[model samples]
Target: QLQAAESRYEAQKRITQVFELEILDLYGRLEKDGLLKKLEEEKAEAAEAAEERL
Candidate 1:
């Protein structure tokens, strides 16, 4: 029981550290752009592409 408990805690700590670093590291990509503009721009491009397929 103790052995598994220790391993479980170790994995939890490792995963938490990795996940937070992921949030911190890639936060800049979204930070540089305005979400609405990106959405609107993407929608226009998508619409054009979709119309071609029709």
Candidate 2:
């Protein structure tokens, strides 16, 4: 479960970075435009998944 969570988070972070660097390439848009919340939720879910392993 921990590994699953890590994998999911890693995948999401990569995808987010892709949009940040390739699609948008703007910190303001990536951060201030509410995309951060999307990433944050993914991270939170990942953490919960990891915790469930133990």
Candidate 3:
């Protein structure tokens, strides 16, 4: 009933929209719990280490 009678296309299309919502929702919860800052700190330290190497 679809291009090549496939469910694979719908599965990819459905989750493409879904993952964006899931990411934003999780980002909100992580920020509320203060884990976002720790995540940022890891990135910050990573940048500092790379800068030192250069």
Candidate 4:
């Protein structure tokens, strides 16, 4: 059982790393496409709108 647990832990670690890499790759693609910039603009607009409401 201990061996099984260790194996599972290693698998989980590998999967987590792969997931993180994929997320970073996706973010890079978004940045290259300017979608990230659009999100930032939308966030700024929302913040400004909220401040105007005050």
Candidate 5:
């Protein structure tokens, strides 16, 4: 029931805000871990790599 559960937006605003912050935090973490540039470079190398494989 993952799809059904996720379709509910009971925590819409707060969850969206958390998502944004987590994205920013994830970007920072990627940079800190020295994967940001490497990953960015992969985009130019392969469009699929830039796509949301996640």
Candidate 6:
């Protein structure tokens, strides 16, 4: 059971590392393309829509 736990932990660590790099790359592109502002705008729109529903 301990060995299995250790293996699972290693797998999770690798996955986290890969996802971290991917997120950095994605955010870098978003920053360059000014998509972050678009994301914020979309979030705001969604919030306003929700408020209107309420």
User: Considering every candidate listed, which one attains the maximal TM-score?
Assistant: 6
* Native-referenced Cα lDDT, model 4: 0.92
Candidate 1 lDDT (Cα, 0 to 1): 0.86
For model 3, how does the per-residue alpha-carbon lDDT over 1-54 read when each residue is reduced to its tens digit? 676647878888889889989999988888888986788899999899899779
Superposition error at 49 for model 4 (Å):
10
Off by over 4 Å in 3: 5-7, 42-54
Report how far off residue 42 is in candidate 6 (Å).
Answer: 5.5
lDDT of 5 by residue, 1-54 (tens): 787667676567778899999999988887777885787887777776556464
Residue 15, candidate 2: alpha-carbon lDDT: 92
Q: Judge candidate 2 at residue 45 and give its lDDT.
A: 90
Q: Each model's C-alpha lDDT?
A: 0.86, 0.82, 0.85, 0.92, 0.78, 0.92
Off by over 4 Å in 2: 24-54
Global Cα lDDT for candidate 6 = 0.92
How well does model 2 score by local distance difference test? 0.82
Tell how far residue 41 is off in model 1, in angstroms: 18
Error of 6 at 52 (Å): 4.8
Clashes of each: 0, 0, 0, 0, 0, 0
Q: TM-scores for all candidates?
A: 0.53, 0.39, 0.53, 0.64, 0.44, 0.66
Give the Å error, residue 26, model 2. 9.2
For candidate 3, the lDDT comes to 0.85
lDDT of 6 at 14: 97
Query: Which residue pairs clash within candidate 1?
Result: none
Clashing pairs in model 5, backbone N/Cα/C closer than 3 A = none
Candidate 6, residue 45: Cα displacement in angstroms equals 4.9
Error of 1 at 2 (Å): 0.4
* Best of the two (2, 6) by TM-score: 6
Tens digits of per-residue lDDT for model 6, 16-39: 999999999988887887887888
State the lDDT at 54 in candidate 2.
86
